[PDB]
Paper text:
Given the auxotrophic nature of pneumococci for certain amino acids, the Ami ABC transporter system, orchestrating oligopeptide uptake, becomes indispensable in host compartments lacking amino acids. The system comprises five exposed Oligopeptide Binding Proteins (OBPs) and four proteins building the ABC transporter channel. Crucially, SBPs determine the specificity of their respective transport systems, thereby governing the range of molecules capable of entering the cell. The five lipoproteins exhibit pairwise sequence identity of ~52–60% and share a very similar overall folding.
Residue numbers in the entry:
A (entry chain C): 1 to 11
B (entry chain A): 32 to 652
């Protein structure tokens, strides 16, 4: 799936 | 009872596991709804709702036997109905009727399904999913897919009860626990926006014996208080904590936790930067004129320009902003497909891609795609590519510097340092009279609506985007299909809409890319198939339509979780996403204890995977 969140692989 | 307490950052737009392809939804529903198969601790595919399964000798027909004691429950825990095979017919038809964003997983695989979705037929009895009786689901495919069973770990193949679906109408799957039914390890007891996600163990779940925490509490984390993770962990309030070595706090923390800092392995989720190839929305920009906007629109379509950005982007400095100087490279990922995601006659996929790069141009000579190092950053190559871009672009009337907008959340302090590093490295190498990275600090609503939760390509409001892909099934195509012009899941983030490729898609060659995908997908021999996808990944690196950045994992933590207790999956959403199997302990794990547990897991995993592959043949009808 599409992964988002904070910037980059952020918490 | 025992409790897992930590944080979350992404509120879901909905709980509609049949219609969404965002991990903001499936990361939650993983804990609430089971499908046919799941993962053990070693990445094997194991029984879930299906206690057994078979495949026909021609590889087109998969039949699953559902366990009799699996039930649906309401969010309050009451029994609704037993799970039946019809729920899988219902699920696929709903995904089709609602035009699910993850339909690429099945539309070209399940017989008759593409005809039904596109209106060539109107009769779902012509689609290749059938309840042969109440405990038996049978799928019929267009062609064999050795990775078909791995697709059942993606939520578009999860079941739904037709009576509930009809009862709920358009209220089904909204961001409210009562909008879905539950047949998985947990019930959802709280879902409060910008506040909390809370799970309670379902004591009546078919596999309750493998759920070792009774409560899971996730506190909303907006990035403005990175020190709170360790603070709450040390106070006994959190079960784990990510560490931030850049912080002023880190000095004393590493003193206090000299022997407890644990680094995770990099995993199969891959992040990369991309460009907005057809920008329509300029609510968040530092450009002041239409000539600047048209100049950037032209620049991102120029291959030399994208390559110049690629070679000017210092991945080490970027990683250092969240990992510190020492650990800066521990998170670096240089392909979209992880370098060891598959192998070809014993050779890792990434070494095959590397062997194919020089063919695309001498600027790639010697490139190494291994995780954990930066093979892209090269100021002299960047300046040379830019000089060629500038001559090509100036002749089209393009004005310099090229301004590129990058968004970041205003509360995301670590993210702000990361995008500041990209600005600094690109402008240092190419010159701020040539390229300017304009950082747009946005509220949560602004950041969501212009990026991850934008519902159309035209709403994307940036020139540069940093997103990622978590694999849905065990084949390179899960990653590489996302840029295809017919149906790519990551097209809207590039400013493109699935459908016929427009002139901007053709200007950058994504039509050719898409034709390459279609030809590679026809290959059924794994070694030949993977080699064709390696060509496709090499083409994509050369195009610099993506700039690979980082993975998940590779980061330091403090832990009171039991090492390697949870499920693991190379693909799908039934590994780390799920709090099934996870265990908590009183002792803060030590680095040495973790390493001993890791070496034990790594060795057991190879042995376990080999036995699982032997077990496969018993399932052939």
């Amino acid at each position: 799936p599409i992964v988002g969140g904070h910037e980059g692989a952020g918490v | 009872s025992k409790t897992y307490n930590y944080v979350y950052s992404s509120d879901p737009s909905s709980l509609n596991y049949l219609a969404e392809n965002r991990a903001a939804t499936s990361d939650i529903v993983a804990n609430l709804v089971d499908g046919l198969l799941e993962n053990d601790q070693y990445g094997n595919i194991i029984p879930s709702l299906a206690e057994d399964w078979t495949v026909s000798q021609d590889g087109l027909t998969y039949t699953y036997k559902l366990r009799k004691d699996a039930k649906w429950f309401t969010s309050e825990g009451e029994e609704y109905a037993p799970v039946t095979a019809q729920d899988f017919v219902t699920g696929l038809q709903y995904a089709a009727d609602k035009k699910s964003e993850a339909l690429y997983l099945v539309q070209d695989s399940v017989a008759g399904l593409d005809d039904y979705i596109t209106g060539k037929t109107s009769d779902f009895s012509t689609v290749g999913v059938k309840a042969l009786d109440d405990q038996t689901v049978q799928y019929t495919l267009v062609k064999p897919e050795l990775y078909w069973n791995s697709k059942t770990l993606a939520t578009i193949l999860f079941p739904v009860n037709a009576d509930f679906l009809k009862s709920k109408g358009d209220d089904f799957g909204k961001a409210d626990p009562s909008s879905i039914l539950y047949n998985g390890p947990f019930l959802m007891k709280a879902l409060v926006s910008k506040s909390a996600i809370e799970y309670k163990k379902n004591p009546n779940y078919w596999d309750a014996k493998n759920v070792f925490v009774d409560d899971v509490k996730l506190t909303y984390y907006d990035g403005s208080d990175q020190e709170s993770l360790e603070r709450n962990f040390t106070a006994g309030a959190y079960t784990t904590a990510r560490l931030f070595p850049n912080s002023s706090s880190y000095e004393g923390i590493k003193e206090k936790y000299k022997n407890n800092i644990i680094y995770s392995m990099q995993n199969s989720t891959s992040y990369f930067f991309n460009f907005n190839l057809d920008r329509k929305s300029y609510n968040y920009t530092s450009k002041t004129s239409d000539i600047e906007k048209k100049s950037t629109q032209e620049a991102v379509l120029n291959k030399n320009f994208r390559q110049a950005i690629n070679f000017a982007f210092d991945r080490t400095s970027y990683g250092a902003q969240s990992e510190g100087k020492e650990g800066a490279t521990k998170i670096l990922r240089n392909l979209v497909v992880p370098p060891n995601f598959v192998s070809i006659k014993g050779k890792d996929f990434g070494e095959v891609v590397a062997s194919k790069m020089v063919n695309y141009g001498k600027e790639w000579q010697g490139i190494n795609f291994a995780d954990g190092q930066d093979p892209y950053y090269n100021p002299e190559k960047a300046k040379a590519k830019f000089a060629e871009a500038k001559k090509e672009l100036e002749a089209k009337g393009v004005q310099f510097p090229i301004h590129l907008d990058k968004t970041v959340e205003v509360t995301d302090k670590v993210g702000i340092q990361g995008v500041s590093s990209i600005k600094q490295s690109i402008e240092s190498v190419l010159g701020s009279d040539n390229v300017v990275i304009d950082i747009q600090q946005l509220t949560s609503d602004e950041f969501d609506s212009s990026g991850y939760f934008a519902q159309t390509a035209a709403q994307k409001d940036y020139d540069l985007y940093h997103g990622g892909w978590g694999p849905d099934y065990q084949d390179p195509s899960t990653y590489l299909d996302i840029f295809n012009t017919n149906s790519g899941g990551f097209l809207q983030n590039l400013g493109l809409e699935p459908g016929e490729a427009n002139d901007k898609a053709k200007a950058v060659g994504l039509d050719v890319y898409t034709q390459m995908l279609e030809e590679a997908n026809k290959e059924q021999d794994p070694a030949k198939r993977y080699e064709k996808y390696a060509d496709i990944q090499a083409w994509l690196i050369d195009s610099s339509l993506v700039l690979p950045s980082v993975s998940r994992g590779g980061t330091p933590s403090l832990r009171r979780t039991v090492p390697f207790a949870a499920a693991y999956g190379l693909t799908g959403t039934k590994g780390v996403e799920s709090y099934k199997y996870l265990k908590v302990q009183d002792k803060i794990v030590t680095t040495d204890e973790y390493a001993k547990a890791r070496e034990k897991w790594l060795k057991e995993k190879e042995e376990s995977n080999k036995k699982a592959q032997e077990e496969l043949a018993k399932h052939v009808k």
